[PDB]
C-alpha cells in the first residue's frame, strides 16, 4: 500500500533510476508533470514494483515516512518550482533527493531554505548517461549527513561497483558539496576530451594518418596507463563509417557550443585563485569552435606554415601518447587542488583519495588512472599538489620530453595544441622558484604606488623609481 | 557661496582629481569621512578654489543645481553606504558620478535604483594612477546620456588630451558601460605587463642578458611601433640600481597575488562565451606566483631542462621583439572582441573606435598601438577582428614565424611563456577551417545523446556508434 522511494520526472534520465531503483528491489513511486510519459512507463514496467501516480498529493500520500524523493526535474526554475509545490505537502524529516545537473550555489541555497522547514535536501551528482542510470551510475551525494545515512542503502545499490566491490557512492559533504564535485568533473571531462583532440589533430594534420590507423592508435593506448572509457570510444568513433562507407566523424561540424556548464568550473576556480589553466583553455576551445562562419572566413586571409613531419612516425605516436598523459596529470593536478581550496572555502571537509574512487566507474572520466589518485591522497592526505607525488612525480619527469617535443612541432607547423601549451607552461611555471611576477610588481609599485616585498629583508616597500 | 562640482573622498585619487578640476577654473566643494584629510587638503590647497565641507548636509548644501557630486570612494559596501546616505539629500536631476574601480554589476544596480528616485548616475572608469589623475586621466563615463552631457565640459576639460588635440573622455554608454570598459582595460594591462615578463624572463634565462642589457633593449624597442607607457617604465625600471649598484628589481619578491581585479575580466568572458585566452592565462599566471613557498618546494622535487641557447642573440631578440608586438595583437582582437559581445547582450551600441580613440593617452595602455587600432575601425567600423585589419593582418601574417620560433625555444629550455604560447594558439586556432572539434561533438553524441550538425548535409542527426 506505501512505496519504498519516489522519483519525480520521467524522462530518459529519470525513469532510468527508477527501473535501476525497482531492480534492487525496492518498490518505486513515479510521478511526472505530463501524464504523457507516466502511462508511457507503465507500458514498459509491467511485472515490476512501479507505482504510477497522477498528482503531487497522491505522489507524496504514496511514500513510507520518513519520505524519499528522487528529483530529476529540469534544472533551474522548474526545480524549484518542483520544489515550492512539494513543500506544503511534505512533513518534517522528509528527504528530498535533486539528480540533475544543478548550480551548486543553488543547491547551497535550496538545502539552507529546506532545512528551516525541517526539510532535508540532498544534492546529488549524476554521472554516465541514460545508460550509466540504468545499470549503475556515479552518485554525488551532499547535503545533510544524517539524511544520506537514511538512504545511503539505496544508493549504494543502484550505484556502479568497481572491480574491488566497492560502489561508485560516497558522502561527499554539506549543502552543496555533491552538485560541487560533480562540476568539477565536467571541468575535468571538458579537458579530457580537448586533450583526445588535439591527439587527434596532430596524427590527422601533422603525421597524415588514416581513420582506421587513428582508431588503432586509441585501441592501443587503451590496452596501457591511458585506459579509459574517453579513449575507449574514441576507438569506436573512428571506425564507424556512414552509407558511403566513410568515416562518419570527419563528416561532422565542428562547432562544439558555447553554452555548456564546463565553464562554470573555471569561473569558480578565477574566484577562488587556483590556476586552472588547461580546463580553462579547453572550454575557451570549445568558444573558438562555435563560430564557424568567422574561421572559414578567417582562414581565407591569415596564412600558416604547411603542416610536415619527416621524421620516425610511430615514434612520435609515442610522444603523443606520453605528452597526453601527461598533460591529463597536470590537468586533474589542476582540478583536485580547486576541490582543496574550494573544500576549505566551504569548509566541507572533502576527502579526495574518497573521490577518485567513485569516479573509478559510472562516470564519463572513468580511467584506471584514478586509482593513483586515490593512493595519492591515501599515502599523503596532506598532499597540496599531485605532481608531487612519487608515481606522478617520476612520470612527468620523464615524459616532459615528450610533451616539449609535440608542443614545440605542433606550433612549428601550425597544429593549435592549447591543452598542451598550457600544461607545459603549467608544469614550468609551478616547479619554478623564481617568476618574472618581480617586474610585475616593479611596475604596479611604479604606476600605482601598490608598495612590494622583497626576498632580500623583511617588510613592505616603496620605491621612487626615477 | 555654492560651488559648481564637489569631491567625496580624499585619498589620493580623490584629492587630485579636485585639483584638477579646480584648475581649469570649476569651483570645487570637498568632503571626507575623516575630517584629518580634508584638513590637510585645506593646507596644500592654498590660493585654490576648494571649499572644505564636514557633513554630507553642509557638502550638498554648497553646491549649485542640478548638483554634481564626483564620488571617490573605497569600491563596495563603502560606496553604498555613502550613496544611501546622499539620497534624502538630493533633488530630482542631481548627478552622482562614482568615479571607483567598481564592478560594472553594481553600477547597473546602483544606476537602476537612483533612477526611481529621479537621480541620475554615472558609473564612471578612471586610468592614469596619481599623475594621470592630477593632469590628466582617460575617462570612461557611462549612464545617462542627457546627464553627461551636463558633466561633459568638465570631463573633457580634466581628460587628457591625445596628440590630435582630442580628449580621452566619451560617452561609452548607458548604465554600467563605464565601468565595463574600465573592467576590459584592466585585463588587457593584466596581459601586457605579462607579455613584457615573459620577454624578460626569455632575455634573462634563456640569453643570460644582465640588467643593463635588458634596460636598453627595452629601451629601443620603445623607439619603434611597441612604443608604450609600459615599455617605457620598464626600461626605467632595470635602469633602477640599490646601495651595492644591484638591479633593484632582482631583489623584489616575485609573488604578484590574488587581490586584483582582472579575474573579473576572465570571468565575464566566460559568461559571454568569449575566447579570453591571453588575458586568462596571465590572470592565472599571478595566481601561480602568489603561491611562492609551493612553487620553492616543487624546484627541489620537480626538474626541468638547463636552458641555453648558441645561436644569434642579437637575432633572437628580435624574435622576442616580434613575438611581443604579435602577441599584443592577439590580446587586443580578444579583448575588442569582448567588448564587442558584451555591447550585443547588454544593447549598450558600443563604439570600439572611441574606445581606443580614449585609450591613447591618460590610461596605463597607452601606447602607439592604441592609434592603430582606432585607425582599423575607422577604416571598416564593421571590422569583425583586428586581425583581419589590412595593417595587422600584414603585421602577424609574417611576425607569425618570430612568435613560433619564440615560443618553441622557451619550450624546448623550460622558460615557461603562458602568453606567447595562447597567443599563437588563438592565431591558428581563429584561422583554422577545420578545428577537432568534430570529434568532441561525436563523444558528447556518442555517451550524451547530445546529437551533431553535419558539414554536407542539413540537419540534426543523432548516430548509434556501435
Ligand atoms: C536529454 O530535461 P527535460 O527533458 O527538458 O526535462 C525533464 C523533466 O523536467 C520536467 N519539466 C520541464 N520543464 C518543467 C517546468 N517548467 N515545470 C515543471 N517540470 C518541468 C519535464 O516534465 P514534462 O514531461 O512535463 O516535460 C520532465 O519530466
Ligand atoms: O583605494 P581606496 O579608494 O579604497 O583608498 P581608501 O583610503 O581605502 O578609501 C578612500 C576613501 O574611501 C573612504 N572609505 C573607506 N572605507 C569606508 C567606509 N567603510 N565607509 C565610508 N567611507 C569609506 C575613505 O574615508 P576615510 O578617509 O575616512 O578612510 C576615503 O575617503
Chains 1, 2 share one sequence.
Not at 604547411?306 to 590537468?331: H, T, V, W
Not at 612541432?409 to 607545459?424: D, E, K, M
Not at 608544469?427 to 616593479?442: C, E, F, G, H, V
Amino acid at each position: 500500500m506505501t512505496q519504498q522511494i519516489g522519483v519525480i520526472g520521467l524522462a530518459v534520465m529519470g525513469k532510468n533510476l527508477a527501473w535501476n531503483i525497482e531492480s534492487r528491489g525496492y518498490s518505486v513511486s513515479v510521478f511526472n508533470r505530463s501524464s504523457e510519459k507516466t502511462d508511457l512507463m507503465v507500458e514498459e514496467s509491467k511485472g515490476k514494483n512501479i507505482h504510477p501516480t497522477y498528482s503531487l498529493e497522491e505522489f507524496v500520500n504514496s511514500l513510507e515516512k520518513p519520505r524519499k524523493i528522487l528529483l530529476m526535474v529540469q534544472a533551474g526554475k522548474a526545480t524549484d518550482a518542483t520544489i515550492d509545490s512539494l513543500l506544503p505537502l511534505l512533513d518534517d524529516g522528509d528527504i528530498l533527493i535533486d539528480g540533475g545537473n544543478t548550480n551548486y550555489q543553488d543547491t547551497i541555497r535550496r538545502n539552507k531554505a529546506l532545512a528551516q522547514s525541517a526539510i532535508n535536501f540532498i544534492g546529488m551528482g549524476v554521472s554516465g548517461g541514460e545508460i550509466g542510470a540504468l545499470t549503475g551510475p556515479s552518485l554525488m551525494p551532499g547535503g545533510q549527513e544524517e539524511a544520506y545515512n537514511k538512504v545511503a542503502d539505496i544508493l549504494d545499490a543502484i550505484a556502479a561497483k568497481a572491480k574491488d566491490g566497492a560502489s561508485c557512492v560516497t558522502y561527499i559533504g554539506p549543502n552543496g558539496a555533491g552538485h560541487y564535485v560533480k562540476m568539477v568533473h565536467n571541468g575535468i571531462e571538458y579537458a579530457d576530451m580537448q586533450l583526445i583532440a588535439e591527439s587527434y589533430a596532430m596524427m590527422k594534420e601533422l603525421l597524415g594518418m588514416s581513420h582506421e590507423d587513428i582508431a588503432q592508435t586509441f585501441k592501443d593506448w587503451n590496452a596501457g596507463e591511458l585506459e579509459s572509457y574517453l579513449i575507449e570510444i574514441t576507438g569506436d568513433i573512428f571506425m564507424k563509417l556512414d552509407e558511403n562507407k566513410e568515416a562518419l566523424v570527419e563528416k561532422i561540424l565542428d562547432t562544439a557550443g558555447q553554452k555548456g556548464t564546463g565553464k562554470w568550473t573555471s569561473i569558480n576556480a578565477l574566484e577562488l585563485g587556483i590556476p586552472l589553466t588547461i580546463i580553462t583553455e579547453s572550454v575557451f576551445a570549445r568558444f573558438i569552435s562555435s563560430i564557424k562562419e568567422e574561421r572559414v572566413n578567417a582562414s581565407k586571409e591569415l596564412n600558416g606554415p604547411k603542416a610536415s613531419f619527416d621524421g620516425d612516425k610511430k615514434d612520435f605516436l609515442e610522444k603523443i601518447r606520453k605528452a597526453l598523459y601527461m598533460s591529463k596529470i597536470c590537468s586533474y593536478a589542476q582540478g583536485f587542488a580547486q576541490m582543496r581550496k574550494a573544500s576549505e572555502d566551504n569548509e566541507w571537509n572533502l576527502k579526495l583519495g574518497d573521490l577518485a574512487m567513485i569516479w573509478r566507474e559510472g562516470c564519463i572520466i572513468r580511467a584506471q588512472f584514478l586509482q593513483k589518485i586515490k593512493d595519492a591522497y591515501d599515502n599523503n592526505p596532506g598532499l597540496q599538489n599531485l605532481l608531487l607525488d612519487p608515481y606522478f612525480k617520476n612520470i612527468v619527469t620523464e615524459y616532459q620530453d615528450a610533451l616539449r617535443d609535440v608542443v614545440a612541432t605542433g606550433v612549428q607547423n601550425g597544429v593549435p595544441t592549447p591543452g598542451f601549451s598550457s600544461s607545459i607552461n603549467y608544469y614550468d611555471s609551478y616547479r619554478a622558484a623564481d617568476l618574472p611576477a618581480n617586474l610585475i610588481q616593479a611596475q604596479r609599485d611604479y604606476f600605482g604606488a601598490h608598495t612590494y616585498e622583497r626576498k632580500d629583508k623583511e617588510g613592505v616597500f616603496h620605491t621612487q623609481w626615477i
